[PDB]
Design an enzyme around this catalytic site. Structure first.
Site, short mmCIF file in Angstrom:
data_model
loop_
_atom_site.label_atom_id
_atom_site.label_comp_id
_atom_site.label_asym_id
_atom_site.label_seq_id
_atom_site.Cartn_x
_atom_site.Cartn_y
_atom_site.Cartn_z
N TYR D 61 -20.15 11.57 38.54
CA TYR D 61 -19.78 11.16 39.88
C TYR D 61 -20.17 12.22 40.90
N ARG D 71 -30.23 12.97 50.94
CA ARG D 71 -30.71 11.89 51.80
C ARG D 71 -29.89 11.80 53.08
N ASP D 75 -31.54 12.36 56.90
CA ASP D 75 -31.43 11.42 58.01
C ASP D 75 -30.77 12.07 59.22
N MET D 79 -32.49 12.46 62.92
CA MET D 79 -31.88 11.87 64.10
C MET D 79 -31.74 12.91 65.20
N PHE D 103 -29.76 5.47 61.13
CA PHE D 103 -28.33 5.70 61.37
C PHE D 103 -27.42 4.79 60.56
N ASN D 124 -11.09 11.98 38.65
CA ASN D 124 -11.38 11.71 37.25
C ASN D 124 -11.30 12.97 36.41
N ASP D 135 -6.50 10.99 27.97
CA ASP D 135 -7.56 10.21 28.59
C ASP D 135 -6.91 9.38 29.68
N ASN D 142 -13.58 2.98 33.28
CA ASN D 142 -14.12 4.14 33.97
C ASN D 142 -15.64 4.15 33.89
N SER D 145 -16.97 1.41 36.21
CA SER D 145 -16.85 1.73 37.63
C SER D 145 -17.94 2.70 38.06
N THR D 149 -21.00 1.99 40.85
CA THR D 149 -21.41 2.90 41.91
C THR D 149 -22.91 3.20 41.82
N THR D 201 -15.21 0.09 42.57
CA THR D 201 -14.20 0.96 43.15
C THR D 201 -12.81 0.41 42.91
N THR D 204 -11.49 1.16 39.53
CA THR D 204 -11.11 2.57 39.47
C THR D 204 -9.74 2.87 40.08
N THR D 211 -2.44 4.96 34.99
CA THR D 211 -2.34 6.26 34.32
C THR D 211 -1.17 7.07 34.85
N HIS D 284 -9.69 1.47 58.21
CA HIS D 284 -8.79 2.56 58.55
C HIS D 284 -8.02 3.07 57.34
N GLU D 286 -9.38 3.33 54.57
CA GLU D 286 -10.35 4.03 53.73
C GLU D 286 -10.48 5.49 54.12
N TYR D 288 -8.19 7.31 55.09
CA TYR D 288 -7.06 7.96 54.44
C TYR D 288 -7.31 8.09 52.95
N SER D 299 -3.30 22.04 48.89
CA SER D 299 -1.99 22.42 48.38
C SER D 299 -2.13 23.25 47.11
N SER D 315 9.11 17.55 50.94
CA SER D 315 8.62 17.13 52.24
C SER D 315 7.16 16.72 52.16
N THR D 359 1.16 14.47 58.75
CA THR D 359 0.12 15.47 58.54
C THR D 359 0.50 16.81 59.15
N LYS D 362 2.63 18.49 56.85
CA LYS D 362 1.79 18.96 55.75
C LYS D 362 1.15 20.30 56.07
N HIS D 419 -15.18 13.70 67.05
CA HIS D 419 -13.89 13.77 66.39
C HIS D 419 -13.98 13.36 64.93
N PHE D 420 -14.64 12.24 64.64
CA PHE D 420 -14.57 11.77 63.27
C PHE D 420 -15.47 12.56 62.33
N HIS D 421 -16.39 13.30 62.91
CA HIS D 421 -17.20 14.21 62.15
C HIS D 421 -16.41 15.42 61.88
C1 HEO Z 1 -11.44 11.94 57.26
C2 HEO Z 1 -11.46 10.76 57.83
C3 HEO Z 1 -10.56 10.54 59.03
C4 HEO Z 1 -9.23 10.86 59.14
C5 HEO Z 1 -8.33 11.51 58.09
C6 HEO Z 1 -8.88 10.46 60.44
C7 HEO Z 1 -7.31 10.80 60.68
C8 HEO Z 1 -7.07 10.38 62.26
N1 HEO Z 1 -7.96 9.74 63.10
FE1 HEO Z 1 -9.87 9.23 63.00
N2 HEO Z 1 -9.82 9.82 61.18
C9 HEO Z 1 -10.84 9.98 60.30
C10 HEO Z 1 -12.40 9.51 60.43
C11 HEO Z 1 -12.39 8.39 61.60
N3 HEO Z 1 -11.43 8.19 62.55
C12 HEO Z 1 -12.03 7.17 63.14
C13 HEO Z 1 -11.65 6.24 64.38
C14 HEO Z 1 -10.31 6.93 65.00
C15 HEO Z 1 -9.81 6.34 66.17
C16 HEO Z 1 -10.32 5.14 66.94
C17 HEO Z 1 -11.79 5.27 67.31
C18 HEO Z 1 -12.02 4.91 68.77
O1 HEO Z 1 -11.40 5.55 69.66
O2 HEO Z 1 -12.81 3.99 69.08
C19 HEO Z 1 -8.73 7.11 66.49
C20 HEO Z 1 -7.78 6.94 67.68
C21 HEO Z 1 -8.72 8.10 65.46
C22 HEO Z 1 -7.49 9.11 65.67
C23 HEO Z 1 -7.13 9.73 64.19
C24 HEO Z 1 -5.82 10.22 64.06
C25 HEO Z 1 -4.73 10.24 65.13
C26 HEO Z 1 -5.74 10.65 62.74
C27 HEO Z 1 -4.47 11.34 62.16
O3 HEO Z 1 -3.86 10.97 60.96
C28 HEO Z 1 -4.89 12.80 62.02
C29 HEO Z 1 -4.20 13.73 63.01
C30 HEO Z 1 -3.97 15.11 62.42
C31 HEO Z 1 -3.37 16.07 63.09
C32 HEO Z 1 -2.87 15.85 64.51
C33 HEO Z 1 -3.18 17.42 62.43
C34 HEO Z 1 -2.69 18.49 63.38
C35 HEO Z 1 -1.23 18.33 63.73
C36 HEO Z 1 -0.54 19.37 64.14
C37 HEO Z 1 -1.20 20.73 64.30
C38 HEO Z 1 0.91 19.20 64.50
C39 HEO Z 1 1.02 18.64 65.91
C40 HEO Z 1 1.76 17.32 65.92
C41 HEO Z 1 1.47 16.41 66.81
C42 HEO Z 1 0.38 16.66 67.85
C43 HEO Z 1 2.24 15.09 66.78
N4 HEO Z 1 -9.59 7.99 64.46
C44 HEO Z 1 -13.25 6.67 62.60
C45 HEO Z 1 -14.06 5.49 63.08
C46 HEO Z 1 -15.56 5.71 62.92
C47 HEO Z 1 -16.38 4.69 63.70
O4 HEO Z 1 -16.01 4.30 64.83
O5 HEO Z 1 -17.45 4.24 63.22
C48 HEO Z 1 -13.48 7.49 61.55
C49 HEO Z 1 -14.64 7.45 60.58
C1 UQ8 Z 2 -35.97 3.81 58.87
O1 UQ8 Z 2 -35.75 4.23 57.55
C2 UQ8 Z 2 -35.81 5.64 57.39
C3 UQ8 Z 2 -37.17 6.31 57.52
O2 UQ8 Z 2 -38.32 5.48 57.55
C4 UQ8 Z 2 -38.97 5.39 58.79
C5 UQ8 Z 2 -37.33 7.80 57.21
O3 UQ8 Z 2 -38.66 8.04 56.84
C6 UQ8 Z 2 -36.41 8.29 56.10
C7 UQ8 Z 2 -36.63 9.71 55.51
C8 UQ8 Z 2 -35.41 10.12 54.63
C9 UQ8 Z 2 -35.54 10.88 53.52
C10 UQ8 Z 2 -36.91 11.41 53.02
C11 UQ8 Z 2 -34.23 11.19 52.73
C12 UQ8 Z 2 -34.38 12.38 51.75
C13 UQ8 Z 2 -34.64 11.80 50.33
C14 UQ8 Z 2 -34.20 12.42 49.23
C15 UQ8 Z 2 -33.44 13.74 49.31
C16 UQ8 Z 2 -34.50 11.78 47.83
C17 UQ8 Z 2 -33.22 11.20 47.18
C18 UQ8 Z 2 -33.36 11.34 45.63
C19 UQ8 Z 2 -33.31 10.29 44.77
C20 UQ8 Z 2 -33.46 10.58 43.27
C21 UQ8 Z 2 -33.10 8.83 45.29
C22 UQ8 Z 2 -32.73 7.81 44.15
C23 UQ8 Z 2 -33.99 6.92 43.80
C24 UQ8 Z 2 -33.86 5.75 43.12
C25 UQ8 Z 2 -32.48 5.28 42.66
C26 UQ8 Z 2 -35.12 4.89 42.79
C27 UQ8 Z 2 -35.58 4.09 44.03
C28 UQ8 Z 2 -36.95 3.41 43.70
C29 UQ8 Z 2 -37.93 3.23 44.62
C30 UQ8 Z 2 -37.77 3.67 46.08
C31 UQ8 Z 2 -39.25 2.54 44.12
C32 UQ8 Z 2 -40.25 2.17 45.26
C33 UQ8 Z 2 -41.58 1.69 44.59
C34 UQ8 Z 2 -42.63 1.25 45.32
C35 UQ8 Z 2 -42.57 1.21 46.84
C36 UQ8 Z 2 -43.92 0.79 44.56
C37 UQ8 Z 2 -44.88 -0.02 45.48
C38 UQ8 Z 2 -46.02 -0.66 44.64
C39 UQ8 Z 2 -47.14 -1.15 45.25
C40 UQ8 Z 2 -47.26 -1.05 46.79
C41 UQ8 Z 2 -48.28 -1.80 44.40
C42 UQ8 Z 2 -49.65 -1.61 45.09
C43 UQ8 Z 2 -50.84 -1.66 44.08
C44 UQ8 Z 2 -52.04 -2.20 44.39
C45 UQ8 Z 2 -53.16 -2.21 43.34
C46 UQ8 Z 2 -52.31 -2.79 45.77
C47 UQ8 Z 2 -35.28 7.38 55.61
C48 UQ8 Z 2 -35.01 7.24 54.11
C49 UQ8 Z 2 -34.72 6.32 56.56
O4 UQ8 Z 2 -34.07 5.33 55.82
CU CU Z 3 -8.86 4.63 62.14
#
Ligand code: HEO
Ligand code: UQ8
Ligand code: CU
Ligand code: 3PE
Ligand code: 3PE
Ligand code: 3PE
Ligand code: 3PE
Ligand code: 3PE
Ligand code: 3PE
Ligand code: HEM
Ligand code: U9V
Lengths: 262, 99, 186, 660
Positions: D61, D71, D75, D79, D103, D124, D135, D142, D145, D149, D201, D204, D211, D284, D286, D288, D299, D315, D359, D362, D419-421
């Site tokens: 895993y 990969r 990307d 970007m 993206f 695991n 086990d 297992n 699963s 993936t 998943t 799993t 367990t 949401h 997920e 967590y 911890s 606590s 949190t 925590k 923020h979410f990064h």
């Molecule tokens: C690791 C993953 C992760 C986690 C754990 C969180 C935990 C939280 N997230 Fe974030 N989020 C995460 C990853 C995202 N969140 C998202 C979307 C999102 C949104 C809506 C997005 C929008 O505005 O459009 C909000 C409001 C938040 C707020 C929070 C809050 C309040 C928590 C809280 O549980 C955490 C707060 C923790 C705190 C505060 C610790 C510090 C506290 C102290 C120090 C004590 C002080 C006490 C108080 C202030 C009461 N999240 C999205 C959406 C992505 C997308 O849009 O595509 C992602 C991926």
């Molecule tokens: C818009 O899309 C994007 C771009 O494209 C513009 C970016 O370039 C990029 C660049 C991003 C990267 C280079 C990421 C970095 C990659 C890394 C670190 C490698 C990851 C490592 C691995 C081991 C990946 C796991 C691989 C697998 C599970 C196997 C996948 C199998 C594949 C892809 C087989 C593909 C086979 C073919 C295309 C064969 C084609 C055959 C033909 C054309 C026959 C032709 C013959 C005749 C005679 C005409 C991406 C991917 C993005 O998605």
């Molecule tokens: Cu959320």
């Protein structure tokens, strides 16, 4: 950034938006600053290399510390939750603005990678550009002709989504005359980078009447739904366009392309 | 799914009733939509419970009392979504109209 | 060593996961129920006698499986495979009626490709029918295993898990007939 | 030989994609030739591919996670480059066609294949050894699963060379992702890539929840387990509840796309909004599902290297349980701008802000662990102190974005990615590295190299700051998500700063490789010969260097909360039992990888509209399920000769260690 579009806004709505943001920040600082500070402080005062420290290996539960570690965060969140109730009720995008005018109604259509604007009370439409006198409520009705977009003018106020077959409502106002950038804040396909429009806040009502006068003189016209469908054809980075005549209830007709009622 | 056969036949009879009554109630049109809806929902939840008791032999003892806490848990979650969803969307519809 | 217990507990937890899977489609049918597009509604395509006969076949199936399990716990092989044969035949009747009705629908331009209402209807009822035909497969394979291996340990644990599954299918059908068919026919 | 699939599905024209494909297939040739040179095929088959050992499966895993992180970061770097260039008035090199693919793929990979398997694999590895079990409740599950993936990963990477990947963003919003607007196959890849993977998943999650309750050791009441198990347990619960939602949502969308249904279409009754509501109901929970396990990790480390007992144990467990509950009543806050009124918004914003107290308790308990301890500055506790500092700020931004009136401005701006990064990289990746540096000796017998690891950590933290803290300011000045062209020049400087930080992160990741390399190269001098390389506290450390295929030869009997430490303290911690007993264990099976191969073929046929082969795939998969239910040669017995041999070995090593 102090000169940011959000931290130096020019519409009332954005003004209270920023005040809200800063009180929330300065409320959360009270328990997040002590956290980091204590983090480094303990990291240093209790490094294994230290000697004078008091190393207690079995101190695992103090009700005082639990009390105060539950007591401050609960208080802060109470206060924030009250503020959130009040503000959320006080800034719903669908809520009229309290001011002595007649709001200007604008209709907003999210065409493939373009913003369409209709002034019905004026009988005109413009592509990628709008205008309205400062200090006058503007009532936006919003619909998407294609895929989910988000109408947003950052320095003026709030954003709102745009769905096809539905109408949405927003209310904004400008406190100072000028030109503001607006964009689509939801990805919508290939030409999403070109969904930029310019919104003007004319100083006077005169200049507004002059801009309406200008639009009134275009060689084009949106009267048949044919011209709507002609213009709605996929395109990118459209130039700002004006239209003289407008099918009276065309916004409704668009929305009806997807059959909503009730 | 093991118990006495007499219990299983009692459950058969009770569920036969708790099906037959709603259907006559709705197709013939005995009462008002409110009494109708109330009784059909009630009777449905009662048949569910009767199946989960006599037909599923669901106890509060088995599996250290975790068979039940699991079940109940699911219920709540379902309640949280099915209702929540229904609420959200319902509202989101009224706020999307040509008012 | 008692592995059947943990096997049965894990199957219970999977069934809870399934209850969630189903509640989501229930909420879907709720949100798009009146979402027809100038087409038929629940009151115009639902004939209730059909639905009640389907119900009674499923209920009968659930009772015969209970009795099959009891026959297990009394160590009769022929009894178990008999009650199992009967259960499988009643469930076959269930799916037979279901496929008859779904086909009569689609062949009259009322398939899931006509309105968000008919689409959700097909989603829910076909999700139930799929679980039921999966159970039918399970029941047949377990029956041939029983006939060739006797009432062993594995087979007994497998009977218990299939029991949970069948009873839960019927329990989900109670709700499907109360919320979709009845609440619509009303 | 049939379907939509053509010779015109591979980017023959593309200089970038095609060199990548050539290089990847050359590298495949490379590893194949290497393995068949050595002659490690049979070994792989009979030890790792068919293994039902939670240790081996967790290792694989984490391997998948680490090798797809590459990969993901590729990307991300591309970007950042495209943006810093488009800001400067330049065409760049990535058209939208490609940029958007990038993206979408990147979000998907880093959320589903990097973040998910890392946590699931650390679980695991360490959960059965912590509860005192031999086990998991379900071994073959297992195996299956893990291989689901792997099927998902194989799909999401085939899309790269043949066809394209979804240009809709990682959650595939309905209208854009429908058959009308996106006729191409990119969404379909997205559809079967996750569905199949999801089917794994869920299992799993079910697998572990059993367990941690049923397969414990006698004497460990639930309030004696180590905090990682508590958190892991909470995480499993949420998986079971959450992933059915994703299953059904993706299923309804594939229905919309394959048969012409109208669940989220624009016309004929559909409603797009419902999708946005459903998927976030899963989305949401997920996040967590990820923050909760890493929490446990910290911890554990907080207690090990501070060398005192965790503060506020009760606590912490009640905090994690409250979090588990409350993680189901906050999803609406991912679409405050979709129009719902003031009441729905206010309620859900409150319920999101109420999720903070747990949190915060925590982190304060974590801090008061360190308070009067002795802090040894190992790589792992560096990761931990950095986690505290970073996650604090991330969650603060999050709380501030949970206030709807502010989300009205900051929604989808770069503030959201900032923020979410922040929270993911801070809270998640930080802790997964902490966990690998913590439990590496327990999995291979040697310790990682400290210097290169410290270098990695410092580069990571500084680079995350210099990459993402300019995006707070950027999202403040109006720049929104997913722009790729003619970017407003007043965003140039900040963006050109962001890319700099990205470079820094590369170095960190580069460090990681070096840290790994110089470790393995030098595995024969830096071994953990006791089994306890840190002065640990929980039961895993009581086992061997690399533990035996059976975690313990005689299931321990617990009496207190930290089991191993109190054993080390009474004076009775290494006490050879008197008579050893045969151990009943499960066998290795090749059936799972076969189900998985059939599943891969099935999905790839569904994505390219090859119907006979999709039929053969499903058929074969279910058929194989039905044939593995027949054979009863499923378990074996380990005799006492081997158990005595191995335990004599380990107690020799111990008597030699206490000896010198
Ligand atoms: C690791 C993953 C992760 C986690 C754990 C969180 C935990 C939280 N997230 Fe974030 N989020 C995460 C990853 C995202 N969140 C998202 C979307 C999102 C949104 C809506 C997005 C929008 O505005 O459009 C909000 C409001 C938040 C707020 C929070 C809050 C309040 C928590 C809280 O549980 C955490 C707060 C923790 C705190 C505060 C610790 C510090 C506290 C102290 C120090 C004590 C002080 C006490 C108080 C202030 C009461 N999240 C999205 C959406 C992505 C997308 O849009 O595509 C992602 C991926
Ligand atoms: C818009 O899309 C994007 C771009 O494209 C513009 C970016 O370039 C990029 C660049 C991003 C990267 C280079 C990421 C970095 C990659 C890394 C670190 C490698 C990851 C490592 C691995 C081991 C990946 C796991 C691989 C697998 C599970 C196997 C996948 C199998 C594949 C892809 C087989 C593909 C086979 C073919 C295309 C064969 C084609 C055959 C033909 C054309 C026959 C032709 C013959 C005749 C005679 C005409 C991406 C991917 C993005 O998605
Ligand atoms: Cu959320
Ligand atoms: C073991 C379990 C096995 C799996 C269980 C599957 C889940 C079963 C859940 C039952 C679904 C409940 C559906 C409620 C009715 C839906 C509906 O459409 O009513 C909406 C109602 C407006 O009326 P409306 O029905 O639209 O008009 C008549 C149409 N014939 O608007 C409303 O105001 C109705 C709101 C009622 C809320 C009902 C919530 C029920 C929660 C049950 C919890 C189960 C756990
Ligand atoms: C959960 C998800 C539920 C799945 C929903 C399934 C949706 C099915 C969509 C069907 C698309 C239309 C295909 C079609 O046009 O087939 C026509 C053909 C008609 O059959 P015909 O020749 O008239 O007579 C056969 C008598 N045995 O064949 C037929 O269509 C008639 C037979 C229909 C089979 C009904 C069972 C499918 C329901 C699965 C649930
Ligand atoms: C689509 C949705 C698919 C949902 C599938 C639902 C899976 C249901 C499995 C539920 C099992 C949970 C309880 C665990 C249990 O007790 O089952 C027995 C077995 C665990 O015991 P085990 O470790 O295997 O001991 C050795 C036995 N040889 O565990 C087992 O169950 C054996 C493993 C069986 C799993 C087979 C999965 C087949 C995959 C079919 C996917 C079809 C995809 C179609 C496209 C849609 C996506
Ligand atoms: C389209 C997808 C359609 C899916 C069709 C699925 C057909 C599968 C039938 C399975 C028949 C084989 C069962 C063999 C068996 O003996 O299982 C016994 C097992 C008890 O455990 P054990 O003794 O260890 O056996 C493991 C050995 N395999 O007990 C088991 O674990 C067997 C578990 C079978 C449960 C299957 C549940 C299917 C649920 C359908 C989900 C559909 C969701 C789609 C809706 C999305 C929206
Ligand atoms: C959640 C699970 C969702 C599953 C979606 C199934 C989609 C069915 C695809 C069939 C599309 C179609 O139009 O039929 C094509 C062909 C004529 O008719 C055919 O003969 C194609 C048969 C397709 C077999 C699919 C089996 C998968 C189970
Ligand atoms: C997984 C890869 C592990 C391969 C097995 C390592 C091994 O057995 O040693 C080979 C090689 C010898 O290195 P030394 O010892 O001299 O060990 C090495 O020095 C090369 C190992 C490269 C691993 C890179 C890690 C990323
Ligand atoms: C090496 C560190 C990382 C960098 C530099 C990075 C960079 C980025 C960038 C630049 C974006 C798009 C920004 C924009 O829309 O303007 C993005 C999106 C995203 N990243 Fe990351 N990321 C990193 C790590 C991660 C990790 C660890 C995850 C784990 C979940 C993750 C998940 C996502 C997701 C889900 C998206 C959204 C995808 C989308 O909206 O299309 N990233 N990342
Ligand atoms: C789609 C394909 C699926 C791929 C699945 C992956 C299967 C690859 C298994 C390879 C493992 C072979 C290791 C044998 C070496 C040994 O045990 O001795 O000699 C040595 O000691 C070498 C040790 C090598 C360690 C490499 C670990 C890298 C991954 C990080 C995992 C760390 C876990 C942190 C707790």
């Amino acid at each position: 950034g102090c000169n940011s579009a959000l931290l130096d806004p020019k519409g009332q709505i954005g003004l209270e938006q920023r005040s809200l943001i800063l009180t929330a920040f300065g409320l959360m600082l009270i328990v997040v600053i002590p956290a980091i500070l204590m983090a480094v402080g303990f990291a240093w005062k209790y490094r294994a290399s230290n000697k004078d420290a008091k190393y207690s290996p079995n101190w695992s539960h103090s009700n005082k510390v639990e009390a105060v570690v539950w007591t401050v965060p609960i208080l802060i969140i109470i206060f924030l939750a009250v503020l959130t109730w009040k503000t959320t009720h006080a800034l719903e995008p669908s809520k009229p603005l309290a001011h002595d005018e007649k709001p200007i109604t604008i209709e907003v259509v999210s065409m493939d990678w373009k913003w369409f604007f209709i002034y019905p009370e004026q009988g005109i439409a413009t592509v990628n550009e709008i205008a309205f006198p400062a200090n006058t409520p503007v009532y936006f009705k919003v619909t998407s002709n294609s895929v989910m977009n988000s109408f947003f003018i950052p320095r003026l106020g709030s954003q709102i989504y745009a769905m096809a077959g539905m109408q949405t409502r927003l209310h904004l106002i400008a406190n100072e005359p000028g030109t503001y950038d607006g964009i689509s804040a939801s990805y919508s396909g290939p030409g999403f980078s070109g969904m930029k429009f310019k919104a003007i806040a004319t100083p006077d009502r005169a200049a507004f009447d002059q801009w309406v006068a200008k639009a009134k003189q275009s060689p084009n016209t949106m009267s048949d739904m044919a011209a709507f469908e002609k213009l709605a054809a996929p395109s990118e980075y459209n130039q700002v366009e004006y239209f003289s005549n407008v099918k009276p209830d065309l916004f409704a007709d668009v929305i009806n392309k997807f059959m909503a009622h009730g | 799914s093991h118990g006495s056969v007499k219990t299983y036949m009692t459950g058969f009879i009770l569920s036969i009733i708790l099906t037959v009554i709603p259907f006559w109630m709705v197709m013939t049109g005995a009462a008002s939509p409110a009494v109708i809806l109330g009784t059909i929902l009630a009777m449905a939840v009662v048949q569910v419970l009767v199946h989960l008791v006599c037909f599923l032999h669901m106890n509060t003892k088995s599996d250290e009392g975790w068979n039940m806490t699991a079940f109940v848990f699911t219920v709540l979650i379902i309640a949280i979504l099915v209702v929540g969803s229904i609420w959200i969307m319902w509202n989101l519809n009224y706020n999307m109209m040509m008012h | 060593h008692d592995a059947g217990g943990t096997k049965i507990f894990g199957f219970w937890i999977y069934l809870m996961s399934d209850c969630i899977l189903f509640s989501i489609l229930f909420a879907t049918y709720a949100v798009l129920v009146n979402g027809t597009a100038g087409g038929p509604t629940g009151k115009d395509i639902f004939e209730l006698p059909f639905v009640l006969v389907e119900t009674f076949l499923l209920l009968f199936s659930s009772i015969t499986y209970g009795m099959a399990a009891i026959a297990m716990y009394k160590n009769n092989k022929s009894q178990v495979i008999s009650w199992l044969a009967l259960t499988w035949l009643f469930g076959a009747g269930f799916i037979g009626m279901e496929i008859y009705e779904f086909h009569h629908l689609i062949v009259n331009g009322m398939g899931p490709d006509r309105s968000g209402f008919l689409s959700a209807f097909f989603a829910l009822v076909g999700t139930h029918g799929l679980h039921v035909t999966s159970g039918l497969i399970w029941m047949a394979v377990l029956m041939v295993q029983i006939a060739r291996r006797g009432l062993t340990s594995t087979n007994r644990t497998r009977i218990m898990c299939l029991s949970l599954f069948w009873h839960f299918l019927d329990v989900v059908w109670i709700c499907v007939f109360t919320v979709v068919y009845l609440m619509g026919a009303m | 030989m049939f379907g939509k699939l053509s010779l015109d599905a591979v980017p023959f024209h593309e200089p970038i994609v095609m060199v990548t494909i050539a290089g990847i297939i050359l590298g495949g040739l490379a590893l194949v030739g290497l393995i068949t040179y050595f002659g490690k095929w049979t070994y792989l088959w009979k030890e790792w591919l068919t293994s039902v050992d939670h240790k081996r499966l967790g290792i694989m895993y984490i391997i998948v996670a680490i090798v797809m992180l590459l990969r993901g970061f590729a990307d991300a770097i591309m970007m950042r480059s495209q943006q810093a260039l488009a800001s400067a008035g330049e065409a760049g090199f990535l058209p939208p066609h490609h940029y958007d693919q990038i993206f979408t793929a990147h979000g998907v990979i880093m959320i589903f294949f990097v973040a998910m398997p890392f946590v699931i694999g650390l679980m695991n590895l360490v959960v059965p050894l912590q509860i005192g079990a031999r086990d998991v409740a379900f071994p073959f599950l297992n195996n299956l699963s893990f291989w689901f993936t792997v099927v998902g990963v194989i799909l999401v990477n085939v899309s790269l060379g043949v066809g394209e990947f979804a240009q809709t963003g990682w959650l595939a919003y309905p209208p854009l992702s429908g058959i009308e607007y996106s006729p191409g196959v990119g969404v379909d890849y997205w559809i079967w890539s996750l569905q199949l993977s999801g089917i794994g998943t869920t299992l799993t999650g079910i697998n572990f929840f059993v367990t941690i309750l049923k397969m414990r050791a006698p004497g460990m009441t639930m309030f004696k387990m180590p905090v990682f198990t508590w958190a892991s347990l909470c995480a499993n619960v949420l998986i079971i509840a959450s992933f059915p939602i994703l299953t059904v949502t993706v299923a309804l969308l594939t229905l919309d796309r394959y048969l012409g249904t109208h669940f989220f279409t624009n016309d004929m009754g559909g409603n797009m909004m419902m999708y946005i509501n459903l998927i976030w109901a899963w989305g949401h929970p997920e996040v967590y599902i990820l923050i909760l396990p890493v929490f446990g990790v910290f911890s554990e480390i907080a207690a090990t290297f501070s060398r005192k007992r965790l503060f506020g144990y009760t606590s912490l467990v009640w905090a994690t349980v409250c979090i588990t509950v409350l993680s189901f009543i906050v999803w609406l806050h991912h679409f405050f701008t979709m129009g719902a009124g003031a009441n729905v918004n206010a309620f859900f914003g409150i319920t999101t802000m109420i999720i903070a107290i747990p949190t915060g308790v925590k982190i304060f308990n974590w801090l008061f662990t360190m308070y009067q301890g002795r802090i040894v500055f190992h790589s792992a506790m560096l990761w931990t102190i950095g986690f505290i500092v970073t996650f604090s700020v991330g969650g603060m931004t999050g709380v501030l974005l949970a206030v709807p009136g502010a989300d009205f401005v900051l929604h989808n701006s770069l503030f959201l990615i900032a923020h979410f990064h922040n929270v993911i990289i801070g809270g998640v990746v930080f802790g997964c590295f902490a966990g690998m540096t913590y439990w590496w000796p327990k999995a291979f017998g040697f310790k990682l190299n400290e210097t290169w690891g410290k270098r990695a950590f410092w580069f990571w933290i500084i680079g995350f700051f210099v990459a993402f803290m300019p995006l707070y300011a950027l999202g403040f000045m109006g720049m929104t998500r997913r722009l790729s062209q003619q970017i407003d020049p007043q965003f140039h400087t900040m963006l050109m700063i962001a890319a700099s930080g990205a470079v820094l992160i590369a170095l960190g990741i580069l460090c990681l490789v070096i840290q790994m390399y110089v470790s393995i190269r030098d595995r024969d001098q830096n071994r953990d010969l006791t089994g306890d390389p840190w002065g640990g506290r929980t039961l895993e450390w009581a086992t061997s260097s690399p533990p035996p295929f059976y975690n313990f030869a005689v299931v321990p009997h617990v009496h207190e909360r930290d089991a191993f430490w109190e054993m080390k303290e009474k004076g009775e911690a290494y006490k050879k039992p008197d008579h050893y007993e045969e151990i009943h264990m499960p066998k290795n099976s090749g059936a799972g990888i076969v189900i998985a191969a059939f599943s891969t073929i099935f999905g790839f046929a569904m994505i390219w509209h090859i119907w006979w082969l999709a039929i053969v795939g499903f058929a074969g998969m279910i058929i194989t399920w039905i044939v593995k239910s027949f054979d009863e040669d499923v378990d074996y017995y380990v005799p006492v000769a081997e158990i005595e041999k191995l335990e004599n070995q380990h107690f020799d090593e111990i008597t030699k260690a206490g000896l010198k």
